[PDB]
Amino acid sequence: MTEYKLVVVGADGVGKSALTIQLIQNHFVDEYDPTIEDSYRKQVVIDGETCLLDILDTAGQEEYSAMRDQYMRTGEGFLCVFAINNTKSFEDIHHYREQIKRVKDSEDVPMVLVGNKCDLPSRTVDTKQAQDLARSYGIPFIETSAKTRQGVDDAFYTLVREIRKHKEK
Ligand SMILES: COC(=O)CCc1nc2c(N3CC(N(C)C)C3)nc3c(F)c(-c4cc(O)cc5ccccc45)c(CCC#N)cc3c2n1[C@H]1[C@H]2CN[C@@H]1C2
Numbered sequence: 269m270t271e272y273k274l275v276v277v278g279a280d281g282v283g284k285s286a287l288t289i290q291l292i293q294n295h296f297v298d299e300y301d302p303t304i305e306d307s308y309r310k311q312v313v314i315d316g317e318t319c320l321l322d323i324l325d326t327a328g329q330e331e332y333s334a335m336r337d338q339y340m341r342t343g344e345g346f347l348c349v350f351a352i353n354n355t356k357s358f359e360d361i362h363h364y365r366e367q368i369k370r371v372k373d374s375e376d377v378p379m380v381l382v383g384n385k386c387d388l389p390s391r392t393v394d395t396k397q398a399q400d401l402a403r404s405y406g407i408p409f410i411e412t413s414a415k416t417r418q419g420v421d422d423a424f425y426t427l428v429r430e431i432r433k434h435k436e437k
C-alpha cells in the first residue's frame with residue numbers, strides 16, 4: 269500500500285468539507301462547521317494500486333507563519349477548489365497556486381483545479397474560463413458536486429495520478 273498526503277484548498281464556502289466527507293462517507297453533509305480544519309483517511313484501489321489517501325480539509329483564518337508554511341509543505345498534491353456560482357472563489361485560485369509553489373519551492377507541484385457545486389443552476393464561472401485557467405497552469409480541470417457525488421472520485425483519483433506522474437519525472 270502507498271500513502272498519499274492530499275490537501276484541499278480554496279475559499280471559505282466552496283465545498284471543501286462537503287467534498288471531503290462525500291469521499292470518506294458517501295453522503296452529503298450540509299453546513300459542516302466552517303472553522304474546523306481536520307484530516308481523514310480513505311483506503312481505495314486506484315488503477316490496481318491500494319492507496320491510503322490522507323486528506324487535509326483546510327479551514328480558518330488567512331495567516332502565514334513558518335509553522336503554517338511547514339504544514340502546507342507536507343502536502344504531496346493539492347485540490348484547488350472554487351465554486352461555479354462564486355466568481356471571487358475562482359479569482360482566488362491564482363493565490364492558492366502561488367502559495368503552494370512558494371512553500372514547496374517548486375514550479376511543478378501536483379494540482380487539480382476543481383469547479384464544485386455543478387448541480388446548481390446559478391452558474392457565474394463558465395466551463396471554458398476554468399478549462400483555460402487549468403490549461404495555463406498545465407493541470408487537469410474537473411467539475412464536481414459534493415451534493416450528488418458527480419466528479420468526486422474523478423477529482424481525487426486524478427490528483428493521485430498527477431502525483432504518480434510527478435514521482436516519475
Ligand atoms: C472568502 O474569504 C476567505 O476564504 C477567508 C479565508 C481564507 N482566505 C485565505 C487566503 N486568501 C484570501 C485572500 N486575501 C488576500 C484576502 C488570500 N489565502 C490563504 C492562504 F494563502 C493560506 C496559506 C498560508 C501559508 O502560510 C501557506 C500556504 C500554502 C499553500 C496555500 C495556502 C497557504 C492559508 C493557510 C493555509 C491554507 N489553505 C489560508 C488562506 C485563506 N483563508 C483560509 C480559509 C479558506 N482558505 C483557507 C481556509
Ligand SMILES: Nc1nc2c(ncn2[C@@H]2O[C@H](COP(=O)(O)OP(=O)(O)O)[C@@H](O)[C@H]2O)c(=O)[nH]1
Nearest residue numbers: 280281282283284285286298299385413414415
Ligand atoms: N448544492 C451544493 N451545495 C454544496 C456543495 N458543496 C457544498 N455545498 C454547500 O455549500 C456550503 C459550504 O460548504 P462547505 O463544505 O462548508 O465549504 P468549505 O467552507 O469550503 O468547507 C454548505 O452549505 C454546503 O452544504 C455542492 O456541490 N452543491
Ligand SMILES: [Mg+2]
Nearest residue numbers: 284285302327
Ligand atoms: Mg470546511
